[PDB]
RNA sequence: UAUGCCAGCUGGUGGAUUGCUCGGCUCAGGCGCUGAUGAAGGACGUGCCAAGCUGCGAUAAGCUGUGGGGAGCCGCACGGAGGCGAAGAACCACAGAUUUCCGAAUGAGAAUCUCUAACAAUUGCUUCGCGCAAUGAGGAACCCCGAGAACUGAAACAUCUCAGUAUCGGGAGGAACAGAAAACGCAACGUGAUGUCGUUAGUAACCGCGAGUGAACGCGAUACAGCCCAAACCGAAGCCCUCACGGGCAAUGUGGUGUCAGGGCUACCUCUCAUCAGCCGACCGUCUUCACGAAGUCUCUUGGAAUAGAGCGUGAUACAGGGUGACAACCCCGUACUGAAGACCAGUACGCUGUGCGGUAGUGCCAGAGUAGCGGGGGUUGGAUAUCCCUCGCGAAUAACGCAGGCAUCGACUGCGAAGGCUAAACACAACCUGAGACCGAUAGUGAACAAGUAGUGUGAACGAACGCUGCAAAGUACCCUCAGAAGGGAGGCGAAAUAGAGCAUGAAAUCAGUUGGCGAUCGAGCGACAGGGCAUACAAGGUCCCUUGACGAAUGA
RNA sequence: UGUAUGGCAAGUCUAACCGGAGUAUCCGGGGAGGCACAGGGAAACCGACAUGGCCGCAGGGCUUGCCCGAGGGCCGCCGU
């Protein structure tokens, strides 16, 4: 198919052929499997102290004093799982493999499928993104990589009728639960992904919910956050070309 | 650190010289233009305007700056005890704005006027 | 919902009487215990059988059936096209760490092939010669005497 | 329960064609595709060459693999073909998707089931 | 209706629950020795008033210097009194001063004290004098060398297994150990120091051939680095102490040469950039710390308080996180960007000085003995005839010789020179620093969020808890009455709230006081389920229900 | 050792590790090696049906009982 290139003013500047990978059939089950694997592989090993509750010479008195055969020390119960201050019976273990394996072919197919989901305007709108376009992904010229100011990227996205997505992501949610105590108090909607070629866009990175990536290493996660296909993306002309052989 | 526990810890357990940054208030439009700073370390000679509490809108001289409790006393910003004595209501400098400065110290004036440093 | 997830409330977790899931007595001893007494069933019988030759006096031959060569001749355009001629040593995988290359005779030979290998089976010759072809033994293959 | 959306659609399409049109094959193929993956067909070319004939579409209720030789000018229809299978079939005949076979022949006529 | 039963209401009791996190738990990166120059640890001191903790040491919460920092300060800990600070304090970094007693504890003794100069004790050097030095003890685990169980498994048990594990003795370091082939043995026209990781593989091997046990060569990686003696031939040409003088060592050999690309000697060719000794000496990177650092504290409404809702506006290489009277990019700290310092890499790399690599011919000059090897007895190992080691006995050759290649002997072949020595880097741990989290969230998580190894128990070894939360601000309740009264109570005052009033957010159940509804002093006990009646009921969140008659009308049926 | 789902398929998967980077995630390398592709025999050693016959389910075909009949079933035959 054909993809319309846009200049830094938001006007048309020709068109190049939209590569073959954008016609790869959308496969949400494989995309979801790849995101599930990526999210799991960054999780840290944890577990309670191997000796927690075992640091006592507590012994059971056995039969005779009208008491249950529970290990006691200084007339206080210890060690056993049913005892207060006792060991955890089946606790989280550090030795546990918390990683998920994925075949390269299966993962590569998911990258290709997620890239393709980016080319369907209805799937992108189904995902939740707010925009006023027909043609998707938004293809921009390589001169996008030379932009320095964030405010300049706002102007271009306003000219491209695609800024409404950043307004959607300009609302932080204060999560329910104790994640707050561990550093995970806030979260926000995922907005526009910016795929460049040389270096990730320093100019676009701070935009609400925006994620910046490069064509050589853009993965399933930035292409489909949370496993949900169809992210409103914007490619650089050279990025569109390089993302073809992935 | 991004961790909340460590963040609050470093603020409460901060040494005395590092507690100066805990008693900083925003400068007025004129003072921001004059010295090239957005905020300043509140001194016991400065005039301040209350922007947030129950005393919002009131002006007054800064009578005391407690570094340990990271709080300030401003003139007439008081509470009336049961006996009748008017005791100061401590204010967080974050809810306050500096209108006039005490430049009796040569070092503070020089620090405010230098483009490479800040006060 | 799994089997494991439906166990809360069952008391016994599928173990029958609560007197069952105790120690090793429920298993009849630890590991392979009683492989000749109470649990002799479906166990390989006791004893020694045969001998082993030292591993460095052992030869490992790389094998290939005529059917594998014959089905892939048109696809093997990177090898000699005579009046087809193919050096089998260049076709078989893991032929570096192997002692010798042997062509076996399973399947059909629909083409006229001139195969070069270290060893051939009686049936590998019969099928190649029987369809207008030749069999060439290597200088390493000159051990058959 | 199938996890692939494309297979779920193919089964639904094979069912629609079995009921609407006069076909008995597509509903029979749908029933095998609803069965576990291990029971699905994993057929090599040497079997299509042995049992198929020209002008009779070969229907594989699974996947076609590339071992062996195929000389016959046959049209093979399957859920998927391996890279080598599709290449070797297109050289002498035509490798068609089961999805196209339902559109080209909704009545399921002149067709041979191979597994 | 008393005693009383059930449910509820008001108030307690209790401290669950919800919310909160100054603590834990785990992972990751960095870094890593201390001590006779007396450590670590402990004791006793030390403040204006000082019990605990922390700090400090008779100069005692401290003294000096440089730098940073800055108008405040006098630790935890908000008191009273008083004091210090522009003579630039506090505070932080680096450096230094002081640094009681016991403690390896070292003059001698001793429950932290005492008695009349002290490296006690063991050593090396030696001016033979404690003159100059060394050792001792500590450290989270890691590391190396020795000693070495049992429960257990085998459904008993003895070999075997648990296991060279637990535990014990000795010892080093920041890492240890190992290490430049008498190797390997995909047998080769092949590999080429050593660790380690992946694999080889639960393969070979062991084993009441039961249960169990269990490598290696090779390969892919990580990191890479190779050398010094003894002897031959030289023979004092040498080394140590001292400023010197001078002394000490050394023919029982200091020093030169040399070290399997064998070397030496003799005769020659050429040449060095090898090696060894020594000088200089980083970039980068990583870890930590620091400087700088954009933009609203505008309108209205609610509120005790606006970070809320509605409205308007701004920054962003900064929309990580925290603070702030409620949810904050723009109020404060920070965060991006840029820059700075220290530490580690590393006294390494590079560079340099000096030295001199190598080759030919001849020469039986040299080349590590209780060894190699054999035997008796044991341990250990996968090591089977073929592991490694200990012990008793025996015991060789001399490169023209010897060892190895998984049974012995002999021959051939291939590999390699033991019985002397050193060696960077890649790997282990987590004390210490920093970072991180689908970990726990105060009966959890450490025993320990609190006085925590605290209170407390035991002669002792040892054992060992519980206790988090007023409020936006102490505004932490003046005055009056009562009372034996700083008690308590009443009234009163503050605050949005005192049912937030001090172990003070919330405030469950068990349960207690008072009280409401129902039952109740002639009557029977799994306490109820389902039906149906009495009596009782503010709203809200349910709105149906009764009777005449009529319609429909299964089975059944006058 | 089964099973369900998914990728690839006469193949399939990388391990340690290396480079990149948005730096534990992730992108690209890495096939060492494992399992499968032939078995039988203690070993020496030898080395197989890309189909020859008959039934016949599903499905297809026809002129509507008659044909073709994957899979499956019964035999042949082949390796040791
Ligand atoms: Cl064998
Ligand atoms: Cl097949
Ligand atoms: Cl080798
Ligand atoms: Mg516990
Ligand atoms: Mg909750
Ligand atoms: Mg300034
Ligand atoms: Mg003494
Ligand atoms: Mg036993
Ligand atoms: Mg037995
Ligand atoms: Mg063992
Ligand atoms: Mg070996
Ligand atoms: Mg020398
Ligand atoms: Mg043993
Ligand atoms: Mg606790
Ligand atoms: Mg309370
Ligand atoms: Na304990
Ligand atoms: Na009891
Ligand atoms: Na793990
Ligand atoms: Na049980
Ligand atoms: Na090899
Ligand atoms: Na009574
Ligand atoms: Na360190
Ligand atoms: Na005290
Ligand atoms: Na000191
Ligand atoms: Na000494
Ligand atoms: Na002496
Ligand atoms: Na037993
Ligand atoms: Na017994
Ligand atoms: Na045994
Ligand atoms: Na504020
Ligand atoms: Na012996
Ligand atoms: Na050898
Ligand atoms: Na508690
Ligand atoms: Na391979
Ligand atoms: Sr008894
Ligand atoms: Sr303080
Ligand atoms: Sr304080
Ligand atoms: Sr069961
Ligand atoms: Sr037990
Ligand atoms: Sr038996
Ligand atoms: Sr291979
Ligand atoms: Sr090397
Ligand atoms: Sr020697
Ligand atoms: Sr032999
Ligand atoms: Sr409690
Ligand atoms: Sr006792
Ligand atoms: Sr009152
Ligand atoms: Sr009765
Ligand atoms: Sr009727
Ligand atoms: Sr692969």
In this structure, is the CB of residue C137 within 7 Å of any atom belonging to strand F?
A: no
A201 phi/psi in degrees, rounded to 5? -65, 105
**H or E stretch including B47?**
strand B47-50
Is B in contact with A (3 or more beta carbon pairs below 8 Å)?
Answer: yes
In this structure, is the CB of residue A55 within 7 Å of any atom belonging to strand E?
A: yes
In this structure, is the CB of residue B24 within 7 Å of any atom belonging to strand E?
A: yes
In this structure, is the CB of residue C55 within 7 Å of any atom belonging to strand F?
A: no
Is the torsion defined by CA of C88, C93, C95, C101 positive or negative? negative
CA C82 to ligand 21 center in whole angstroms: 123
- For residue A215, the cross-strand partners are none
D105 phi/psi in degrees, rounded to 5? -145, 75
- Please give the DSSP secondary-structure letter assigned to residue A44: P
Q: Find out whether the peptide bond into D89 is cis, omega within 30 degrees of 0.
A: no
How many angstroms away from the CA of A143 is the closest CA of chain D? 40
Tell which of B3, B4, B5, B8 to mutate to test the A interface (max A CBs under 10 Å). Answer: B4
In this structure, is the CB of residue A42 within 7 Å of any atom belonging to strand F?
A: yes
Is C in contact with A (3 or more beta carbon pairs below 8 Å)?
Answer: no
Dig out the tokens for B102 from the structure: 């005490």
Are residue C78 and residue C125 in the same domain, yes or no? yes
Q: How many CB atoms lie within 10 A of CB B108?
A: 17
Task: Count up the domains in chain C and report the number.
Answer: 2
Are residue C57 and residue C122 in the same domain, yes or no? yes
- For residue C87, the cross-strand partners are C116
Task: Return d(Cα C79, Cα C111) in angstroms, integer.
Answer: 15
Chain F bases near protein Cβ (<7 Å)? 3-14, 20-22, 24-28, 30-31, 33, 38, 42-51, 58-62, 68-71, 79
- Please give the DSSP secondary-structure letter assigned to residue A59: B
Residues 6 or more apart from B13 whose CB is under 8 A from it? none
Per the CB < 8 Å rule, is A27 touching D3?
no
Subunits in contact with chain D (3 or more CB pairs closer than 8 Å): A, C
| D2: chain A residues, CB-CB within 8 Å | none
Find which nucleotide's C1' atom is closest to A45's CA. Answer: E27
Task: Return d(Cα D69, Cα D87) in angstroms, integer.
Answer: 12
CA B20 to ligand 7 center in whole angstroms: 54
CB C103 within 8 A of CB C115: yes
How many residues belong to chain A? 246
Task: Return d(Cα B113, Cα A38) in angstroms, integer.
Answer: 52
Structural domains present in chain A: 1-246 (3.40.1370.10)
Are residue C16 and residue C64 in the same domain, yes or no? no
Q: Please tell me which residue lies nearest to nucleotide F26, judged from CA to C1'.
A: A219
Are residue C60 and residue C124 in the same domain, yes or no? yes
What are the distances in angstroms from CA A148 to CA A141, A214, A233, C4, C57?
Answer: 15, 17, 19, 56, 72
Show me where chain A is broken: residue before each gap, C-N > 2.5 A: none
Task: Return d(Cα C76, Cα C74) in angstroms, integer.
Answer: 5
How many angstroms away from the CA of B7 is the closest CA of chain A? 10
Find which nucleotide's C1' atom is closest to B93's CA. Answer: E332
Q: First vs last Cα of chain D: how many Å apart? A: 23
Q: How many CA atoms lie within 13 A of D67 on its CB side?
A: 7
- In chain A, which residue's Cα lies nearest the Cα of B2? A183
Range of the domain at C46: 1-50
In this structure, is the CB of residue D31 within 7 Å of any atom belonging to strand F?
A: no
Which value, in Å, is the radius of gyration of the alpha carbons in chain A?
26
Subunits in contact with chain A (3 or more CB pairs closer than 8 Å): B, D
CA of B14 to C1' of E248 (A): 64
Dig out the tokens for D115 from the structure: 């597994």
CA of D33 to C1' of E317 (A): 55
Nearest ligand by distance to the CA of A52: 4
Triad B21, B24, B28: Cα angle to 5°:
150
| D8: chain A residues, CB-CB within 8 Å | none
Q: A96: burial class by Cβ within 10 Å (0-12, 13-18, 19+)?
A: exposed
CB B8 within 8 A of CB B57: no
Using the Cβ of D69 and the Cβ atoms of chain C, whether some distance falls under 8 Å is answered with yes
Q: Tell me which residue has tokens 């070319």.
A: D45
Triad B49, B51, B52: Cα angle to 5°:
140
Q: Tell me which residue has tokens 């479906």.
A: C42
How many residues belong to chain D? 115
Q: First vs last Cα of chain C: how many Å apart? A: 70
Dig out the tokens for D24 from the structure: 């008995």
What are the distances in angstroms from CA C121 to CA A8, C135, C144?
Answer: 74, 11, 12
Using the Cβ of B6 and the Cβ atoms of chain A, whether some distance falls under 8 Å is answered with no
Whichever domain contains B105, its CATH number is 2.30.30.30
Q: Tell me which residue has tokens 């790389």.
A: C62
DSSP-derived secondary structure for A97-138: -------HHHHHHHHHHHHHHTT-HHHHHHHT-----SS-SE
CA of B5 to C1' of E48 (A): 39
Resolution in A: 2.7
Please report how the helices A104-117 and A28-41 are oriented relative to each other, as an axis angle in degrees rounded to 10. 120
Task: Return d(Cα A64, Cα C99) in angstroms, integer.
Answer: 77
Domain D1-115 has CATH 3.100.10.10: yes
- In chain D, which residue's Cα lies nearest the Cα of C68? D68
Task: Return d(Cα D40, Cα D98) in angstroms, integer.
Answer: 14
CB A191 within 8 A of CB A165: yes
Q: Tell me which residue has tokens 């029979």.
A: D28
Nearest ligand by distance to the CA of D65: 2
Range of the domain at B51: 1-119
Residues 6 or more apart from D36 whose CB is under 8 A from it? none
Per the CB < 8 Å rule, is A25 touching D3?
no
Give Cα A23 distance to the centre of its chain.
24
Q: How many CB atoms lie within 10 A of CB C9?
A: 5
Q: How many CB atoms lie within 10 A of CB A205?
A: 13
- In chain B, which residue's Cα lies nearest the Cα of A185? B4
Among B27, B102, B116, B23, residue whose Cα is nearest residue B61 = B102
Whichever domain contains C30, its CATH number is 4.10.990.10
CA C60 to ligand 11 center in whole angstroms: 20
Q: Which residues from the 61-80 window of protein chain B have CB within 7 angstroms of nucleic acid chain E?
A: 64-68, 79-80
Q: How many CB atoms lie within 10 A of CB C96?
A: 8
Are residue C25 and residue C88 in the same domain, yes or no? no
Task: Count up the domains in chain B and report the number.
Answer: 1
| D68: chain C residues, CB-CB within 8 Å | 71
Task: Return d(Cα B70, Cα A158) in angstroms, integer.
Answer: 45
DSSP-derived secondary structure for A170-221: S--EE-SSGGGGGT--EE-----EEEESSS--TTTTTSTT-EEEETTT--HH
* Per-residue H/E/C for chain C: CCCHHHCCCCCCCCCCCCCCCCCHHHCCCCCCCCCCCCCCCCCCCCCCCCCCCCHHHCCCEEEEEHHHHHHCCCCCCCCCCCCCEEEHHHCCCCCCCCCEEEEECCCCCCCCCEEEECEECHHHHHHHHCCCCEEEECCCCCCCC
């Amino acid at each position: 198919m054909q993809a319309t290139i846009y200049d830094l003013d938001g006007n048309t500047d020709g068109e190049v052929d939209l590569p073959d990978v954008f016609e790869t059939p959308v496969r949400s089950d494989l995309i979801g499997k790849a995101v599930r694997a990526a999210q799991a592989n960054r999780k840290q090993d944890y577990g309670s102290d191997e000796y927690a509750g075992l640091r006592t010479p507590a012994e059971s008195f056995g039969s005779g004093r009208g008491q249950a055969h529970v290990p006691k020390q200084d007339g206080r119960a210890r060690r056993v799982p049913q005892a207060v201050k006792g060991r955890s019976a089946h606790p989280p273990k550090t030795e546990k493999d918390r990683s998920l394996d994925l075949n390269d072919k299966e993962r590569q197919l998911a990258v290709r499928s997620a890239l393709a989901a980016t080319a369907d305007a209805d799937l992108v709108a189904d995902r939740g993104h707010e925009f006023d376009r027909d043609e998707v992904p938004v293809v921009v010229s390589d001169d996008f990589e030379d932009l320095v100011k964030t405010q300049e990227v706002v102007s271009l996205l306003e000219a491209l009728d695609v800024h409404a997505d950043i307004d959607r992501a300009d609302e932080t949610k204060i999560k329910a639960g104790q994640g707050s105590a561990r550093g995970r108090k806030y979260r926000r909607p995922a907005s526009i992904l910016f795929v460049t070629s040389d270096e990730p866009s320093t100019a676009a990175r701070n935009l609400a919910g925006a994620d910046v990536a490069t064509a050589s290493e853009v993965n399933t996660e930035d292409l489909a956050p949370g496993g949900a296909p169809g992210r409103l993306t914007v490619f650089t002309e050279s990025a569109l070309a390089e993302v073809a052989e992935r | 650190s991004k961790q909340p526990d460590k963040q609050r810890k470093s603020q409460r357990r901060a040494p005395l010289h590092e507690r100066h940054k805990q008693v900083r208030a925003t400068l007025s439009a004129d003072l921001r233009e004059e010295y090239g700073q957005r905020n300043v370390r509140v001194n016991a000679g400065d005039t301040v305007e209350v922007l947030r509490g129950d005393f919002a809108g009131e002006e007054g001289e800064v009578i005391n700056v407690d570094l340990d409790k990271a709080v300030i006393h401003v003139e007439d910003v008081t509470l009336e005890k049961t006996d009748g004595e008017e005791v100061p209501r401590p204010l967080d400098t974050s809810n306050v704005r500096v209108t006039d400065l005490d430049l009796e110290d040569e070092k503070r004036e020089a620090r405010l006027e230098s483009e490479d440093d800040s006060a | 919902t799994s089997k494991k997830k439906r166990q809360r409330g069952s008391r016994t977790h599928g173990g029958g009487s609560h007197k069952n899931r105790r120690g090793a007595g429920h298993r009849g001893g630890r590991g392979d215990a009683g492989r000749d007494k109470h649990e002799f069933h479906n166990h390989e019988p006791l004893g020694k059988s045969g001998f082993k030759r030292p591993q460095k006096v052992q030869e490992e031959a790389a094998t290939i059936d005529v059917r594998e060569i014959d089905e892939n001749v048109t696809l093997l355009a990177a090898d000699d096209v005579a009046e087809f001629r193919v050096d089998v040593r260049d076709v078989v995988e893991e032929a570096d760490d192997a002692d010798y290359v042997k062509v076996l005779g399973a399947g059909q030979v629909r083409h006229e092939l001139t195969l070069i290998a270290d060893d051939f089976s009686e049936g590998a010759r019969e099928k190649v010669e029987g369809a207008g072809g030749s069999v060439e033994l290597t200088d390493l293959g000159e051990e058959r005497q | 329960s199938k996890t692939n959306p494309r297979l779920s659609s193919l089964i639904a399409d094979l069912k629609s064609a079995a009921r609407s049109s006069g076909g008995a094959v597509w509903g029979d193929v749908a029933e095998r595709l609803e069965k576990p993956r291990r029971t699905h067909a994993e057929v090599n070319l040497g079997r299509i060459e042995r049992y198929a004939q020209e002008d009779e579409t070969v229907v594989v209720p699974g996947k076609v693999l590339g071992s062996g030789v195929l000389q016959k000018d046959v049209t093979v229809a399957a859920v998927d073909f391996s890279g080598t299978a599709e290449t070797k079939i297109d050289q002498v005949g035509e490798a068609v998707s089961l999805e196209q076979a339902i559109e080209n022949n909704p009545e399921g006529s002149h067709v041979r089931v191979i597994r």
